[PDB]
Design an enzyme around this catalytic site. Structure first.
Site, PDB file in Angstrom:
ATOM      1  N   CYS A 151       0.791  -1.216   0.000  1.00 52.64           N
ATOM      2  CA  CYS A 151       0.000   0.000   0.000  1.00 52.64           C
ATOM      3  C   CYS A 151       0.822   1.262   0.000  1.00 52.64           C
ATOM      4  O   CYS A 151       0.298   2.364  -0.058  1.00 52.64           O
ATOM      5  CB  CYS A 151      -0.917   0.033   1.211  1.00 52.64           C
ATOM      6  N   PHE A 202     -10.357  -3.867   0.232  1.00 52.20           N
ATOM      7  CA  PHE A 202      -9.559  -3.795  -1.007  1.00 52.20           C
ATOM      8  C   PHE A 202     -10.434  -3.735  -2.263  1.00 52.20           C
ATOM      9  O   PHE A 202     -11.370  -4.510  -2.422  1.00 52.20           O
ATOM     10  CB  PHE A 202      -8.598  -4.983  -1.115  1.00 52.20           C
ATOM     11  N   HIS A 294      -2.992   7.873   2.177  1.00 56.41           N
ATOM     12  CA  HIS A 294      -3.472   6.556   1.766  1.00 56.41           C
ATOM     13  C   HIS A 294      -4.700   6.178   2.571  1.00 56.41           C
ATOM     14  O   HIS A 294      -4.626   6.083   3.801  1.00 56.41           O
ATOM     15  CB  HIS A 294      -2.403   5.493   1.966  1.00 56.41           C
ATOM     16  N   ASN A 327     -10.068   0.917  -0.722  1.00 54.87           N
ATOM     17  CA  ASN A 327      -8.622   0.853  -0.623  1.00 54.87           C
ATOM     18  C   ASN A 327      -8.059   0.132  -1.848  1.00 54.87           C
ATOM     19  O   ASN A 327      -8.133  -1.084  -1.935  1.00 54.87           O
ATOM     20  CB  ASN A 327      -8.242   0.122   0.676  1.00 54.87           C
TER      21      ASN A 327
END
Lengths: 378, 379
Positions: A151, A202, A294, A327
């Protein structure tokens, strides 16, 4: 003066949308886990507090039915995951790259360097080569292929591009990150509760930048990168482990990542703020900075926001990306950079960074590793 | 002339167990239970006999292979046991090389600011770069670049990456390491995979490390300067080398004449760095007026490039020495050649670290077909 500058941003996601409210039904159905009612309830609750409204996926019912290994918990499945990821990761990157190149407005023959990041599959030649070919770039473009990065790699590829752009007169760096969850998707299990986190968060996506120093009069700077660092945080060993196995990529989460990051964030920011002090002879509060973070999940954002006493709007660009796309591993923070610029237009901000001068770009990943960049708005 | 990224140290490491190439076919066909494949063995013996290799070093031995029988099959599922080995042994071999480079450099390891790690042997999260950082006790804020699944060109790639790191960051000192272990590629021979015999004959294990920085201090000892770097995909080379990571491990496919493609294009590749030399020196050396630090991909590449460029036979000797003693260690190989170049400069009383010549060429190549070219200056 000569600093690496972001000249364009483009993004792409697979077309099929999966609403988060009903994802648990889809997920437990396709993995033949409808009998696991308590587990499904746990998963629904995780999805409900994820801060995600939808995600985009290449994977769908038909593809998963055709590849039943992927619907098992730990059945052999790497070969079909690779088949998908090796093909689809560069294709999604191409779509993002074309959008960046359009915005930039220059011929693609002027691209001199290509930095590609992914955590979704590996191949030789790599995705960087495939992107070079798909885009018809010059054969002597200098490539850096960053595989299995995790990530933090959205920030990593920006750090890498900074030195490429600054040390090579005339250089124009195409940066691309592209992630497809084919290598991590798997059945839910009561014996792998931490896997539910990834399964809730995800999503798929790709983002591309053009970075260069000394913009020409026909280029249009969006952000400047003034400082970059990377560090392993203390007391974080084994927080995130990612193992590539015959069953695909499996993650293990063994510590409180939101807490660790929050505990260390003031320390992380001291050096870049010292740099600002050098240049401005002033020390802004954290809430006087714009934030390109992030979107690992809602807890990291909430806890950093609380720790640093940020006005609630500061994390909004990041939360907006989480809401719309989830994400997307390495690509995510580059989506946030685009969203920061987009909101500056729609909300009539004085700068590309929420009307503020200085900004922090943050990525994090296995280590626990944090990538920190200091941005200046335009 | 000032400010160029400079190699300040080189260290290398190999697994201790030596496998003589003369009898490697006996060992290989035995441990893979392929002794009944007599014609295939004959072929493999011929390939080994003309490989230019006297020995290779391997972590893998009979005991380990008998404990991991999946690795002794042709395409049996075996990635998990291969990964177990590679993820452990790749950083360990790198540590040995890095300690040697750090000793030569002579500065405290706290002065390392950057780490670039290259491998083709396994992948993990955190990566081998993180493992090496921890093994060496480097500072937690060392800036890392982890280059996985790179292939043979990565010795040159990490040098290219380190050059921009060193040059753009005042005071930066870059630890570079490449480390390769054949656990992910070893497999049984098959008449259905004849190109596999090439790798089985050539690939060995090893690790190499450099320290690179700009503006050496009076207590540092420069070895080579990196003046120019390029990377290019060669024409008409599509699919020449493919490497797929599967449940059976890493499988290579070879579909074209790599030595031929490289030789056909090498003069063109060299035009740009030779024009740099002309810009700095106002003269145009012949190819044989340069020293050569070449990836020892196999004997055919070295023979054909030597012939094409009309090199004195000694120019490739450092490269051939590495091939002879270690085989093709993928990414680490060209860094062993750099060390051998420096070593022979001492023992043969050369006027410079590069065979007594001023300018040199560093070449790596790999899937694409991609060639990495760097222009070096000796000290």
């Amino acid at each position: 003066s000569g600093k690496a500058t972001v000249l364009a941003v483009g993004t792409a996601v697979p077309p099929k949308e999966f609403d988060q409210s009903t994802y648990p039904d889809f997920y437990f159905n396709v993995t033949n886990c409808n009998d696991k009612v308590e587990l499904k309830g746990k998963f629904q609750r995780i999805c409900d507090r994820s801060g995600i409204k939808k995600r985009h996926f290449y994977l769908d019912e038909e593809i998963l039915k055709a590849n039943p290994g992927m619907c098992t918990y730990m059945g052999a499945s790497l070969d079909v995951r690779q088949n998908i990821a090796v093909r689809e990761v560069p294709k999604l990157a191409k779509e993002a790259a074309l959008k960046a190149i359009k915005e930039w407005g220059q011929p693609k023959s002027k691209i001199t360097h290509l930095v590609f990041g992914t955590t979704s599959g590996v191949d030789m030649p790599g995705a960087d080569f495939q992107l070079l070919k798909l885009l018809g770039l010059r054969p002597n473009v200098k490539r850096i292929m960053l595989y299995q990065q995790g990530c933090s790699a959205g920030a990593t590829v920006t750090r890498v591009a900074k030195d490429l752009a600054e040390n090579n007169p005339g250089a124009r760096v195409l940066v691309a990150c592209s992630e497809v969850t084919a290598v991590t998707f798997r059945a839910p299990s009561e014996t792998h509760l931490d896997g539910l986190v990834g399964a809730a968060l995800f999503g798929d996506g790709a983002a591309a930048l053009i970075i260069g120093s000394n913009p020409t009069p026909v280029e249009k700077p969006l952000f400047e990168v003034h400082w970059s660092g990377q560090c392993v945080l203390p007391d974080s060993d084994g927080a995130i482990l990612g193992h590539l196995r015959e069953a695909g990529l499996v993650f293990h989460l063994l510590k409180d990542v939101p807490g660790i990051i929050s505990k260390n964030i003031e320390k992380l920011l001291a050096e870049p703020l010292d740099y600002v002090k050098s240049v401005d002879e002033a020390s802004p509060a954290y809430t006087d900075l714009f934030w390109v973070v992030h979107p690992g999940g809602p807890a990291i954002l909430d806890q950093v926001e609380a720790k640093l006493k940020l006005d609630k709007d500061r994390m909004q660009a990041t939360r907006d990306v989480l809401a719309q796309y989830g994400n997307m591993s390495s690509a995510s923070v580059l989506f946030v950079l685009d969203q920061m610029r987009k909101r500056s237009v729609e909300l009539n901000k004085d700068t590309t960074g929420d009307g503020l001068k200085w900004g922090v770009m943050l990525g994090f990943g296995p280590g626990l590793t944090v990538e920190t960049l200091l941005l200046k708005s335009i």
